[PDB]
Amino acid sequence: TIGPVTPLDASDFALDIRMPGVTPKESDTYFCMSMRLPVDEEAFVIDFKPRASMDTVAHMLLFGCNMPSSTGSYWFCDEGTCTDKANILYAWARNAPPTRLPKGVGFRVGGETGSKYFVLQVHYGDISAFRDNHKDCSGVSVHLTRVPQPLIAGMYLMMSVDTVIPPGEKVVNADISCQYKMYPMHVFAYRVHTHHLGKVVSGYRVRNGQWTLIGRQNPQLPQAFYPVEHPVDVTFGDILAARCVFTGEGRTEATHIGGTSSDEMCNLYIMYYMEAKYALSFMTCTKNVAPDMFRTIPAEANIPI
Ligand SMILES: [Cu+2]
Ligand SMILES: [Cu+2]
Ligand code: NI
């Protein structure tokens, strides 16, 4: 080994979270493994270094989850592994170099209310190179500290629950909105998720009837975290709003929200930071509290990228 925990700086350490020498049989194999945080006190994730085999690795995801495993182990996993409401800490996709965390920012783990386990999912797409039966140890090295950080990263997940897409309908809009009523968050990156019917997903902060884009992306592109130009402050009274556009073309019956590939999802993951003393690591919106606000949604919410 050397070990999974290594020192760095004065009072920091690194957790190498790798696959334990896997060799996948079929292509488009999803493997998971997990590791425990080696301290029980409050600590902060302040960086991620991808250690991926450009050969065969399509994507990696790191979740703050709560799935203990034996130190050798790995297993077949799918999208729902850490639920509905998965706390993604890091995504990596081939051909979408991800973005660093902003200076002073880290994810708050351990303690009485943080994650004690990290779960890593690695997608092996093209398995040409396992012709030869070598073991792959792809993954992420995570820079941890016990030194309090002034800014705390979190995730605001917007998702639709009761959308229905009729067969052959060229356009169905799944709309999501909630008023924001916390201390200020600063949005710096976003990720979108639909299945194959999704055409475009967009999210906005609306303040005083004025729409500010957070992000807009094709969900059929690599589902990584994309940066936000300038961060968007969201603040008490603001409304977060999102629209996924679906088509029914090429379907025979209606499509509902669900986990399988013949079902659909509309998820927008908004990654933010907050000042340490007011911070929440996770918020959720599953409602549409301001449906009529969508009269003024920019037209490009309905235009595929
Ligand atoms: Cu993938
Ligand atoms: Cu899904
Ligand atoms: Ni600025």
Numbering used by the authors: 50 to 354
From the paper:
H107A-PHM-cit has two molecules in the asymmetric unit. Interestingly, the copper sites of these two molecules (A and D) present in the same unit cell have very different configurations, probably because citrate is only present in one of the molecules (molecule D). In molecule A, copper binds at the CuH site despite the absence of His 107 by retaining the coordination with His 108 and His 172 and adding two water molecules as ligands. Even though molecule A does not have a bound citrate, it shows a change in the conformation of the loop containing residues 126 to 130 that brings Glu 128 into the proximity of the CuM site. Molecule D, in contrast, has no copper at the CuH site and contains a bound citrate that bridges the two remaining histidines of the copperless CuH site to the CuM site. Loss of coordination by H107 allows the CuH site to adopt a tetrahedral coordination by the inclusion of two water molecules, implying that square planar geometry at the H site is destabilized relative to the tetrahedral alternative. This observation strengthens the case for a functional requirement for a non-reactive open coordination site in CuH that allows electron transfer but prevents binding of small molecules that could modify the electrochemical potential of the copper.
PHM, a two Cu enzyme, catalyzes the stereospecific hydroxylation of the glycine Cα of peptidylglycine substrates. The two copper atoms in PHM, CuH, and CuM (located in the N- and C-subdomains, respectively), each use a single reducing equivalent from ascorbate to catalyze the reduction of molecular oxygen for the hydroxylation of the Cα of glycine at the carboxy-terminus of the peptide substrate. Crystallographic data on apo wild-type PHM and on several crystal forms of three CuH mutants (H107A, H108A, and H172A) presented here show that the copper ions are required not only for the catalytic steps but also for substrate binding and for locking the overall conformation of PHM in a configuration that is catalytically active.
